[PDB]
Amino acid sequence: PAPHGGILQDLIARDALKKNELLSEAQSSDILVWNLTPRQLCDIELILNGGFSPLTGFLNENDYSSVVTDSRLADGTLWTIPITLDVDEAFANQIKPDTRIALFQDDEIPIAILTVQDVYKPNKTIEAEKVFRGDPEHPAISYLFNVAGDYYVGGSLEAIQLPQHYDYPGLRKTPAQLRLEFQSRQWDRVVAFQTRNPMHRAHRELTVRAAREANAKVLIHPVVGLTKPGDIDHHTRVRVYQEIIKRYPNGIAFLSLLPLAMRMSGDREAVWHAIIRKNYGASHFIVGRDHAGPGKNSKGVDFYGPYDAQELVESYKHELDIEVVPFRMVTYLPDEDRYAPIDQIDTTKTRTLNISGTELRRRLRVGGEIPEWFSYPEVVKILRESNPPRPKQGFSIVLGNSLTVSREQLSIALLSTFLQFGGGRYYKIFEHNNKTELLSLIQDFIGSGSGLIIPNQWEDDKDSVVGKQNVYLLDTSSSADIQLESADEPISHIVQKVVLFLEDNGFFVF
Amino acid sequence: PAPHGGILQDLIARDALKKNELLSEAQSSDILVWNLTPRQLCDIELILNGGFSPLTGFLNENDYSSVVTDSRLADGTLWTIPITLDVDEAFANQIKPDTRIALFQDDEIPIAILTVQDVYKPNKTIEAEKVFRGDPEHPAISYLFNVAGDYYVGGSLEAIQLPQHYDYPGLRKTPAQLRLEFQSRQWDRVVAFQTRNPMHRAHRELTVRAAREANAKVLIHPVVGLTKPGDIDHHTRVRVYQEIIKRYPNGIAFLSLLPLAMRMSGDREAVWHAIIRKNYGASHFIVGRDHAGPGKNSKGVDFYGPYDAQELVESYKHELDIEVVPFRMVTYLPDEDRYAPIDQIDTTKTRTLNISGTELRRRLRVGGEIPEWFSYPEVVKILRESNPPRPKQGFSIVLGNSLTVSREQLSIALLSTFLQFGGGRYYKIFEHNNKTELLSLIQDFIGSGSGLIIPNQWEDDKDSVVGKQNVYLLDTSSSADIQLESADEPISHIVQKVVLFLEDNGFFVF
Ligand SMILES: Nc1ncnc2c1ncn2[C@@H]1O[C@H](COP(=O)(O)OS(=O)(=O)O)[C@@H](O)[C@H]1O
Ligand SMILES: Nc1ncnc2c1ncn2[C@@H]1O[C@H](COP(=O)(O)OS(=O)(=O)O)[C@@H](O)[C@H]1O
Ligand SMILES: [O-][Cl+2]([O-])[O-]
Ligand SMILES: [O-][Cl+2]([O-])[O-]
Ligand SMILES: [Ca+2]
Ligand SMILES: [Ca+2]
Ligand SMILES: [Ca+2]
Ligand SMILES: [Ca+2]
């Protein structure tokens, strides 16, 4: 289909002969420089390559507010997610309209030149409520208030080069390249499948059914840009996709990585996704249950209805110009060994089965066996390998402030004790001295599977530098993960308490 | 490197705007038509896509004889394999210079328009001796005298479309497409590996070493056009390649199918291969032991020296304009579990190991276990599956002419007898009635694993319609595979003889 807006805005192609000139202006000591934030790098790449056609820069206030209140650009073009360049007051104050800024990656690689159209201070509450539905726990809203700059800079781009990536060089196909890919193959019907999770059996069936319904080839188009916090890293997912792609009949599917930065914005994002895939050459786009939805909030309520995206996408149907293949909860059928849309069964006459991602983590974290029917073995293997069960996980024991015994001796006692268990885990008494350069390493070790014995707490002003993950507090306090009887409880007693606690939580298995 | 001759002769690109017109001329009832032979289809495809740059048609006598006697085109361009359009006297007589011929595929798809330059009658003995070294058993020589036409038609081409392929649509990259592939990846150093056999451990190591030595990315560029008779089919090989490519570090290798029609011409072919790989975008080309060599003749002598190709390629080194990475016999080192070039070991101080393809077929045909060190398991699995051991192979027992017993009853006896063994093999008394439409099916069944009981021989004039493979003659004659005592030997006796013979050759296992 025609790219959204009618013209693929591949600015790398457009500005090619200006490459050298733009590069010189980018490195000239007079120009103002902004180092792109991670999410911005994702966005900037989708704007420069045509993925966000018709966009050609970051939204000015006029287009931005139109998108917030109208799900459309100022000119009426259907567009649901605001793409802006968020900066801080300091930087915002050094720019005026007509100014030209150099956009860098890693304060070293010049990406593009942005020509300023305006500098405004968005009402984050409105954006949060009109675009992401208001819940403070919604991922997009948390980013907007805790990570995003309080100033937006609308303006047009002139491309120097897409953001730098040293991984999967062959796979991050640009809209132009994908289209060429489909052509060399004479693929004129392609149904794209969005995703941010590893694909399991349900999804393989889901995508093949779509392939069959639409009479089209399959495009696994996963996000490797930025997804829901706590998601499986894209490296692991890529390995999973590459593995599962082999279970498709020869020549039916194509894999391409999309450096998109999701907002986990349910229905609106679904619309945005469809526009994006259309630019990339797809003729069909799947929209299953709770598409781009972040699940439930701490209170158990849904951020979006499991089918809000489908309804919204349906309502813009006549102007999306890319056919949407909707799917209802695809689930497992024990008695018949096969999956099927829940909309075409049940009646109690048929018994289903469904292993939610929740419980999926649970078995991964507990070395539990994951059903042959649920996911392919090679896939589960890759997953366990990246997310090991507790007996292979790292952790830390922090000797609480209330601790009266010799921290030096209690430390050694724990070390020598853990050491006798064996099991390949590396242990260390780790003294941080409140130096963030040391604190920031704590999660590295835990990530590496090591067990750390930390003799002292770190000041509360530093608590943010340390990832709470697998970090237990040994103390008399009620807020201690491992509660002691008294601050001066004898070492061997404290030791047994720590060991049995770790054993209870699966870190040790005898 | 620059394509050979300086200009990539991608005629599909060149003649694009003449597509419709050429197509009309091609299907006009007045034009003369030649249906391309299989090898010609391979050649025509490499000529139209630039693979044979600087060629732009089939060699006229002047260029042809220059290649035969000078390893160069008439203008001096280094070129070792003659590419000609061979036809029969009947067709040859209907054409003169300036004439335009339509070249079709399957007497249905028009491929190109050849403008005739000349029609000559090559002296096949000179070509055979100067180009392929003269031995009547050499694959290229045999083709030249038994399959090739006795007339060549020199002339220029105008492309309509590359020959049609329905398998591996994505993988048969053209020189233009490959180059783009390498670019999108920013690959400016690429060492290409030629091959017509499945790749085993030695090869994987051989190619990685070359990647390391040349500081270049790896291009597995296998031939799926036409190779040495009796080779493993390309479908099985492609499955093997796609499987083995996964053993390379992520993003170090790329796979592309080359529809080349080999001549198994040792050293000359190696030169030709290097020229072809250069056109396809490679900066380096591997030339190992006995490259493009057809082994030994029936008398046990070598068609080429194990390193003739290396020497020939070395002598044209300064004008190939593509760097050659030579390799000596790469072999296995038990005691150290690793492979290495034989040129950097031995001295008896080190013990090697080498499973020749010969003996490899042997185990494949005998269900023997193939060493973990020799090849990856997933690969052997694919091979066994395409080339099953005897107990899963088909066969035929032909009731000899000398037979005096009731052929009807002896047939039934063998059928009932084989039926009681079980083992998934399908059996059938097959009456051919000397009808080639039936005879031509004999090998289809054998290929399908079935056992055939044929009550009568076919007339000697038809013997050629039937593939000798797994076809045994039961007769009193000395030339019978299963020799009978007398023409009237009682059935149970003949039956035991046939059963034990088949058991002895592995078709039956109890
Ligand atoms: N069981 C299912 N039934 C229907 N659709 C599904 C199912 N599971 C996943 N999908 C769809 O698969 C696509 C990607 O799934 P996910 O990676 O879990 O999350 S998403 O944030 O990208 O939507 C979405 O269209 C989603 O709705
Ligand atoms: N053991 C080996 N040592 C060195 N080179 C080898 C070895 N085995 C295969 N090769 C090389 O691998 C390439 C392709 O091998 P093959 O498929 O068997 O045959 S060929 O006909 O394409 O040359 C050639 O360059 C060949 O010389
Ligand atoms: O399915 Cl993934 O959440 O593991
Ligand atoms: O290596 Cl092949 O001859 O099987
Ligand atoms: Ca703020
Ligand atoms: Ca719900
Ligand atoms: Ca006390
Ligand atoms: Ca002849």
Ligand SMILES: [Ca+2]
């Ligand atoms: Ca020899």
Ligand SMILES: [Ca+2]
């Ligand atoms: Ca007798």
Ligand SMILES: [Mg+2]
């Ligand atoms: Mg990039």
Ligand SMILES: [Mg+2]
């Ligand atoms: Mg073709």
Ligand code: NA
């Ligand atoms: Na720096």
Ligand code: NA
């Ligand atoms: Na409000």
Ligand code: NA
């Ligand atoms: Na439709």
Ligand code: NA
């Ligand atoms: Na709703």
Ligand code: NA
């Ligand atoms: Na349209």
Ligand code: NA
């Ligand atoms: Na417990």
Ligand code: NA
């Ligand atoms: Na060159």
Ligand code: NA
């Ligand atoms: Na026909």
Ligand code: NA
């Ligand atoms: Na070199």
Ligand code: NA
């Ligand atoms: Na020699």
Ligand code: NA
């Ligand atoms: Na040169």
Ligand code: NA
């Ligand atoms: Na024998």
